[PDB]
Amino acid sequence: SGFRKMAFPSGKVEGCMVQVTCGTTTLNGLWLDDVVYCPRHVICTSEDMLNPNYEDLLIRKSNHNFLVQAGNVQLRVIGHSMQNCVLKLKVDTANPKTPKYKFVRIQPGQTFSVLACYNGSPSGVYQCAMRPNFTIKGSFLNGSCGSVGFNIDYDCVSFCYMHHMELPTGVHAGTDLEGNFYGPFVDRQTAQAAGTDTTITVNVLAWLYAAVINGDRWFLNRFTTTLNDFNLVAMKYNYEPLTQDHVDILGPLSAQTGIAVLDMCASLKELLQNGMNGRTILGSALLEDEFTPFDVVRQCSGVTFQ
Amino acid sequence: SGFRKMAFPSGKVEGCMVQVTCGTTTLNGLWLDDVVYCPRHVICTSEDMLNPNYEDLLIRKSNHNFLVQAGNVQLRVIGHSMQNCVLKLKVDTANPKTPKYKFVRIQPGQTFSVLACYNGSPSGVYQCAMRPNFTIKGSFLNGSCGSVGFNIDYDCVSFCYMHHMELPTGVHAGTDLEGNFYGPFVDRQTAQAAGTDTTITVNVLAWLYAAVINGDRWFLNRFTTTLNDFNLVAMKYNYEPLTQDHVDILGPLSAQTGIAVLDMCASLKELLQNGMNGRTILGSALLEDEFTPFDVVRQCSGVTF
Numbered sequence A: 001s002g003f004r005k006m007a008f009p010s011g012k013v014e015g016c017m018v019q020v021t022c023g024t025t026t027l028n029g030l031w032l033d034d035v036v037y038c039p040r041h042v043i044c045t046s047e048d049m050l051n052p053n054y055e056d057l058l059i060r061k062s063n064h065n066f067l068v069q070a071g072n073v074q075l076r077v078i079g080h081s082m083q084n085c086v087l088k089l090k091v092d093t094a095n096p097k098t099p100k101y102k103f104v105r106i107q108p109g110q111t112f113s114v115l116a117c118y119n120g121s122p123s124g125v126y127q128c129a130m131r132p133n134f135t136i137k138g139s140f141l142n143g144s145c146g147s148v149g150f151n152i153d154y155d156c157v158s159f160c161y162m163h164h165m166e167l168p169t170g171v172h173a174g175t176d177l178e179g180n181f182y183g184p185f186v187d188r189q190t191a192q193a194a195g196t197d198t199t200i201t202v203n204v205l206a207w208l209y210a211a212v213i214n215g216d217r218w219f220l221n222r223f224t225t226t227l228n229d230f231n232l233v234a235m236k237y238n239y240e241p242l243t244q245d246h247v248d249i250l251g252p253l254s255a256q257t258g259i260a261v262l263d264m265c266a267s268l269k270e271l272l273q274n275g276m277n278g279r280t281i282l283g284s285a286l287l288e289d290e291f292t293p294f295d296v297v298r299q300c301s302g303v304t305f306q
Numbered sequence B: 001s002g003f004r005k006m007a008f009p010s011g012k013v014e015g016c017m018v019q020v021t022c023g024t025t026t027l028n029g030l031w032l033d034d035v036v037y038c039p040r041h042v043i044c045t046s047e048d049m050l051n052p053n054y055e056d057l058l059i060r061k062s063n064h065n066f067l068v069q070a071g072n073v074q075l076r077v078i079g080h081s082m083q084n085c086v087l088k089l090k091v092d093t094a095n096p097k098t099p100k101y102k103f104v105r106i107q108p109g110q111t112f113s114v115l116a117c118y119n120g121s122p123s124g125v126y127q128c129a130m131r132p133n134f135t136i137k138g139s140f141l142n143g144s145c146g147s148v149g150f151n152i153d154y155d156c157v158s159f160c161y162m163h164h165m166e167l168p169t170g171v172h173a174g175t176d177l178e179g180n181f182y183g184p185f186v187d188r189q190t191a192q193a194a195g196t197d198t199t200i201t202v203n204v205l206a207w208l209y210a211a212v213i214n215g216d217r218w219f220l221n222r223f224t225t226t227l228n229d230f231n232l233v234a235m236k237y238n239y240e241p242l243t244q245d246h247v248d249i250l251g252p253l254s255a256q257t258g259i260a261v262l263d264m265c266a267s268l269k270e271l272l273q274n275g276m277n278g279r280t281i282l283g284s285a286l287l288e289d290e291f292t293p294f295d296v297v298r299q300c301s302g303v304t305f
């Protein structure tokens, strides 16, 4: 019993973190096979960031302008290429720790683990959701760039996020491992606005089910509702609209708990119209939307990874 | 910027998790050098648990009644011993992944990372605090026993907790790596009451400072209080009394933020007397007491390992 924000074990990712230095800049990179992946703005200086011409800036760089360090091992760079906002340094040694991996571009509403790193050294791990507006609410200081987010499925690391920048609101933005940002953001030293955000309605319901699984039930109504009228209540409160595809995903949780998706929606309605009364659900005074249906199940059924 | 519950990187611990099987029971164990550490109740059957005589029960076991597995490697057991509530199986192969490690009994109020494991396979990592009543609020299912909690200093893993049981309230209890429980608990299939809890006042203050570091300041008052009067307000609300040693530990946070410990206590008074008005601090509608002053500094200054 009990229910926590839980990150994946970070071992397989730790063996892939190096420090990349270009000129005065140093940030983190991801060492897979004989390629190191890092944010392209490692080639910019202090001024370049205002509006960099990266193609021009990278043309002025050669292979030996890059120092890649895996602990104390010095990898020689033997080729360099720029894919979208990601720089790829081809090195001479294939990382012996390379796990089975994929590159994956995740959908809004999905979750992943972040291994926050500084100078190529892991500092901590935590779980995040890709918000509907393509930002994340994490913990990154100067030098955290090139820290990566990932999911582990059995034996395979799925990398989905590489950190690039922080916004004025204090949320975070980055790219997939192919270098394309999530959201409308660009890698220049500018103030950029993410969208209005919305609450991930499907995740909020998966967490209410997690709550029921774990003995919390004070919020369960008798009343029921309709997918159409609930969405009228969703939109008034900034929740992404609940689709029938969402009902079917929520299906095994609705099934395990014996509580119809529609019925749960009505309990959610009252919570939204009526607040929480100074009460708590799974130790929070707010509705949590950073657990997917799959995260609830994996945690509530004890999934492990090889 | 930003402030999250952050676990330590779990790599060094992952290479230490094995699965221990005795008879029908299988739980996790911790493999360091030529010794495997696991909860002693792996010796017990379904019925033994009601009130086991562990000495008698282990006397009936021999080395070969233990199957220890590190993935597929079958370690052979060449000696077994019982230290408090912990069973030590001496094996023939020293774990080659053994990191630099210590065994540490943490004080209440301190925090640590938990690598939740099933069948000797890591499943997830999260951060926890040892409550003042010597329980933890975690996520453990059947078979999570022998999962361990730890801190990483730089190179050195400090093991401080091994999981043994869940309580009726849904909180969790266990031992240090020497086998002595935290709290008044015993390893038998009984319903056991943890004490009244209290809120870790020093941690709540450190989190309010973390809030100030990260731009949240709506709770800062001009009013000030005194250590004596604040405690009369802490007690009415079930907050661990604040000592002068606490003020001094909070000292560099109080210093970084230019806000006197005393003044912050006053803002906390009003938060306690007045609620939060439907507002939030670092993304929560509650006062958070599971961050030590050191956790705030580590996170807000980027410490690595």
Ligand SMILES: *C(=N)[C@@H](CC1=CCC=NC1=O)NC(=O)[C@H](CC1CC1)NC(=O)c1cc2cc(F)cc(F)c2[nH]1
Binding pocket: A027, A041, A049, A140, A141, A142, A143, A144, A145, A164, A165, A166, A167, A168, A169, A172, A186, A187, A188, A189, A190, A191, A192, B001
């Ligand atoms: C990379 N290490 C990281 C630095 C960072 C600093 C503080 C908090 N969180 C962080 O993640 N990113 C950067 O320094 C980027 C540089 C690359 C173009 C993307 N820049 C920013 O993150 C940045 C710049 C800037 C200007 C501004 F007016 C307002 C901002 F929010 C802002 N953010």
Ligand SMILES: *C(=N)[C@@H](CC1=CCC=NC1=O)NC(=O)[C@H](CC1CC1)NC(=O)c1cc2cc(F)cc(F)c2[nH]1
Binding pocket: A001, B027, B041, B049, B140, B141, B142, B143, B144, B145, B164, B165, B166, B167, B168, B169, B186, B187, B188, B189, B190, B191, B192
């Ligand atoms: C070990 N794997 C783990 C089982 C566990 C099950 C469910 C949720 N969390 C868990 O941690 N621990 C146990 O099975 C122990 C056995 C050892 C004596 C300590 N038992 C319990 O945790 C347990 C027994 C029991 C009886 C009761 F009446 C009320 C309880 F809360 C209770 N808990």
